[PDB]
Every structure is written in C-alpha cells, then in structure tokens.
C-alpha cells in the first residue's frame, strides 16, 4: 500500500484541472524559462542550406494549481502525465522538417516540485534553415541562426527568459561535433520582440558561428593551379628553334587548366553571383593564354 498514498495525492492533484487554461489566466503572465543542451551538431549542407541540430530542449514554468503537500517533495512522473497538464507551445520560426523521437517510449520527463515549479524536456532533432553568403568562398565565416518563440500567445500572456545567465545557457557538448567541413566557434543569444498582423510575440534567438576549413581545398585546387602556372612559365627557357616542342608545351598547359577548372567548379554550389574562387581560377586561366599569345608573337 506504499503506492496508495501517492496515487491518492496524484488523483486529488488532477481533480478538476483544466488544461486549456494557462496558469494564472487573470493574474500575472506566465514566464516560461528555456535552456538548450545541444548534444551533437549535425552535418551542415551547402546545397539545401539546412543544418541539422540535436537538442535537449528544456523548459520550466511556475504553475500554481499543481502544488501539493507530501513526503517525496519531488515527483518524477512518467511520460504519459505530460499530456494532461498545460504545456506551452514552442515552435521554431525557421525549421523546415523537425522530428521528435519516439524510440522506445516518448522522450519526455516531467518533474513536479512541491512549490509548483515544473520541468519539461524533449529530445528533438531540429532541421533549421540558415541563409548563407558564399561571396568569400571558400574562406567564408557565416553564422546560422535558430529562432524559437511562443505561438498563439501574445507578449501579454507568455514571456520567455533564459534559465541561466545568457552566456551559459546554450551549451554544446565536448565531443558532439559530428561535423567535417566547418569548425564550430561559439554561441550567441539575444532576446527580442517580433510584431506581426496578429500581435507582438516574444522570440528568443541563438546564433551558431561557423568557419570553413581550407586545408582540403589547398591541396585540391589552388596548389595544382600554382604548379600549372609555374610549369607554363617554363616555356621561355626552351630553345626558340624547336617550334613544335614549344607549341605542344603551351597547348598542354591550357589543357591542364581546363581539366582542373572543370574538376574544381563541379563541387561549388549554384549561385547567381561569382564566388571568390572564380576570380583566382579566371586569372590562373588567363595567364596561360597570355604566355601562349606571347609565344605566338615571338
């Protein structure tokens, strides 16, 4: 019968609880507290311009009706309890296709303290959207955002505040960066207010900074370009009488440039303007024509 006391407490707790009404309807606004613990930062994609992120999206708000007097003072209720009480709706302003896992039992823990403070956390897999500026490719340092705000409740009813001091709220795991191209730098958080046709809604913001690694592209494209240009400048030291040799030597450098440029420009994602590697490739490609026309006039 050691569970009967707790079952009676809980059934009395849910006696006449109306989940459609947020806590303190006519009283002060509800003040949700948010905190993210990014488990692993997924593969950023250049083509689709989406980045996958994993989070343990934590929440906490003070609900007055759920207070109780009991022996345990911290109820670690199951996952099914989370649906009957109020749960604030928190969507992602720029997330294309998210997913909440349902692996072996819905991943949601609900803790009720004696005071009435709740705790509520999910294990999402967010797939946001971040516009990129490839004007400095492949040396760009762009920042992908993540905006989450309350829905269906204006600013006069629900206000978000970071759980801890904002510098130490959005935490990234030590070895969780399953990311290959870029390198992670830090986090930046900033509250805000976004006015719309319906009303004024509160909107938290998070900026993740990224900087592309160049070590691969150095041994991929730039160094073959430099080698090809240096090779095309070798023709001047050949003898002026051996005409066919110099002609073949000049033509094959252009052939190499064409092959290299075609191989390199394929991986570049489609853009309207011209990337910063295009200028280098164009100049590297024009110097060989210069040397060829020089040989011609000679």
């Amino acid at each position: 019968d050691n569970t009967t006391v707790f079952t009676r407490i809980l059934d009395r707790l849910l006696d006449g609880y109306d989940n459609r009404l947020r806590p303190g309807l006519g009283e002060r606004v509800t003040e949700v507290k948010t905190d993210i613990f990014v488990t692993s930062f997924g593969p950023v994609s250049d083509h689709d311009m989406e980045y996958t992120i994993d989070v343990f999206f934590r929440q906490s708000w003070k609900d007055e009706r759920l207070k109780f007097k009991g022996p345990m003072t911290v109820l670690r209720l199951n996952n099914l309890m989370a649906s009957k009480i109020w749960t604030p709706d928190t969507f992602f302003h720029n997330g294309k296709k998210s997913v909440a896992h349902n692996m072996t039992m819905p991943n949601k823990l609900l803790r009720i303290t004696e005071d009435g403070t709740l705790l509520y956390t999910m294990r999402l897999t967010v797939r946001a959207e971040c516009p990129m500026h490839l004007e400095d490719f492949p040396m760009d340092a762009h920042a992908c955002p993540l905006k989450f705000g309350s829905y269906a409740y204006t600013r006069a009813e629900v206000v978000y505040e970071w759980t801890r001091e904002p510098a130490r709220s959005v935490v990234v795991a030590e070895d969780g960066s399953r990311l290959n191209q870029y390198d992670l730098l830090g986090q930046t958080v900033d509250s805000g207010i976004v006015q719309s046709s319906t009303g004024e809604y509160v909107v938290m913001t998070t900026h993740f900074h990224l900087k592309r690694k160049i070590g691969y592209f150095v041994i991929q494209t730039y160094l073959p370009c430099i080698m090809t240009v240096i090779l095309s400048q070798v023709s001047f030291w050949l003898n002026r009488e051996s005409v066919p040799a110099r002609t073949v030597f000049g033509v094959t450098t252009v052939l190499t440039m064409t092959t290299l440029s075609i191989s390199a420009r394929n991986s570049l994602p489609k853009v309207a303007y011209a990337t910063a590697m295009d200028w280098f490739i164009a100049v590297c490609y024009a110097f060989v024509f210069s040397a060829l026309i020089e040989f011609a006039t000679v």
Epitope: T117, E165, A167, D190
Partner: antibody, heavy 116, light 106 residues
C-alpha cells in the same frame, strides 16, 4: 519590498553577517544578488545565489573572502564576510533579478565601517 | 572579464535641454544593457531594461537605443529632479557595471 540590517561597525580581522529580508514573494522563484559601492565610485559585483538549489558564484577577486547563504524558510539571504581589512569601507546592497536580468528592486543599503 | 566603458565622465546641462550619454561595451553583449538612476543618498532604481524598453512608472522623456556593442541613453526635457548618477550595466554574463556619470545642472 526589501529590508537589511542596521549600520555595522567592526574592527579589522573580525567577520560581520549581513541580512536581506524579502517580504511579498518567495525567493525560491528568482535569484539574489549582492553589490557593493565605494564612496564616489562605480558599482561592483560580489556574488550570486540561487535559493532553489543553493548554487553560488563569486567575483574572482572576492573569491574566498565572501560567503553567501540563504534561509528559504525564514525568507532571507545572509552575507557573511571573512576577516576583513580596513580597505572595504563601503555600502552593500541586495537585489532581485527583474525581467531581462536587470536588477530592479534594491535595498536601502547598509554601511560597514572598519574602525579601531 | 567584460569591461564597460562609459562616456562622458561628467557633464552639466541647463534645464530643458537635450542630453545624450554613451556606454561602449568592449566585449559582446546582446542587448542586455540596463541603465540605473541613483539620486544622492538613496538606493538605485531601474530606468531602462534591455534596450528601448521603459520600466513601469518611468516618465516618457527617458529613451534609450541599443546595438550589438554600442548603447545610448537619450533624455528628453531635463528637469530639476533628474540630476543624479547614471550607471550602465550589462547582464549578458556575470554582471559588471560602468564607471558612472554625474549630471549636475547649471
């Protein structure tokens, strides 16, 4: 909203205990701060306590010289100093976090003078 | 440690004139600056929290604007009682305050 202890006079080397009582709200909701102010200078931060869990942080320059403990039941936060020198002769404040982490409610402040 | 440089150090302005203060922040602080008013021999009060948001009970002449690292307070028609000290303090991280500005009427 907030009250503090009366003016304090103590000789150097001893330790004094200051109190900030919050009336009208349970402190277990918000944090509590402590700020000192020298004469004709800018404010300076001391520490930060969380009455929900008991966690504390401190300004690296005051670390080891100040201790912040709270009594959730009597609804009061206590600041107990270490062996204090004749230098820190200034007023101490207690604050409560506001909306955007701006310390909105301030106490009248107590004056700690180190004399002989 | 974040440092908060406040300028000017002290300035005097006549009644009914426009007054503008600046609080340059060396590190990054994302719009969590808060301006405090301290009259002589009283306790500080909260004027502006965040940026361009007025705490309740504050007159309409107190207005501020904010950016990533540059912050500005803009008083309207200064009055007789508005002479006090003004402190800018960021709470993005473990909070720290500025030096402080004293504004005596002329």
């Amino acid at each position: 909203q907030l009250q503090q202890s009366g003016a304090e006079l103590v000789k150097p080397g001893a330790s004094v205990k200051l109190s900030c009582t919050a009336s009208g709200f349970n402190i277990k909701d918000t944090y509590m701060y402590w700020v000192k102010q020298r004469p004709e200078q800018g404010l300076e931060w001391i520490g930060r306590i969380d009455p929900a869990n008991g966690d504390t942080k401190y300004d690296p320059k005051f670390q080891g010289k100040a201790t912040i403990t709270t009594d959730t039941f009597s609804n009061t936060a206590y600041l107990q100093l270490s062996s204090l020198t004749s230098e820190d002769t200034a007023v101490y404040y207690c604050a409560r976090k506001g909306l955007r982490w701006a310390m909105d409610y301030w106490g009248q402040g107590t004056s700690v003078t180190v004399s002989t | 440690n974040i440092v908060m440089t406040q300028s000017p150090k002290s300035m005097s302005m006549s009644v009914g004139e426009r007054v503008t203060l600046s609080c340059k922040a060396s590190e990054y602080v994302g719009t969590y600056v808060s301006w405090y008013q301290q009259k002589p021999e009283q306790s500080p009060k909260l004027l502006i929290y965040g940026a361009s948001n007025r705490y309740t009970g504050v007159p309409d002449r107190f207005t501020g604007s904010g950016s990533a690292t540059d912050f500005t307070l803009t008083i309207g028609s200064v009055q007789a009682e508005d002479l006090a000290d003004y402190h800018c303090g960021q709470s993005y991280s473990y909070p720290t305050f500025g030096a402080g500005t004293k504004l005596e009427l002329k």
